Amino acid sequence: YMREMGTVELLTREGEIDIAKRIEDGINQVQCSVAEYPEAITYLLEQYDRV
DNA sequence: CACAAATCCATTGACAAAAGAAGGCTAAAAGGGCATATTCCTTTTGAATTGTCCATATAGA
């Protein structure tokens, strides 16, 4: 385990910021893909009524 | 050998204890959420197999 974790190198602070921006990009892409789906709204409407 | 009485087995009935449940409770058990910065652990003996040279037989030059 120590070897396989030692091959990978650490991160720079700006590096971590880059990775975080990548994650936001992914999550926003998936939220937009959900947004182009009408039943994505229908399910939330039904659930609110349930509450 | 029949008729008169004391002694048995059965239901009425009620009555108290006991248990199966149900709810109301409370102790407890299990999640979840934490944002100055944390970067690589602490005795031999023998046999059988496996990896290492050696004899050697053959094939080209």
From TrEMBL:
It is found in: Cytoplasm. It comes from the Bacteria. Interacts transiently with the RNA polymerase catalytic core. Sigma factors are initiation factors that promote the attachment of RNA polymerase to specific initiation sites and are then released. This sigma factor is the primary sigma factor during exponential growth. Belongs to the sigma-70 factor family. RpoD/SigA subfamily. This is RNA polymerase sigma factor RpoD. The gene is rpoD.
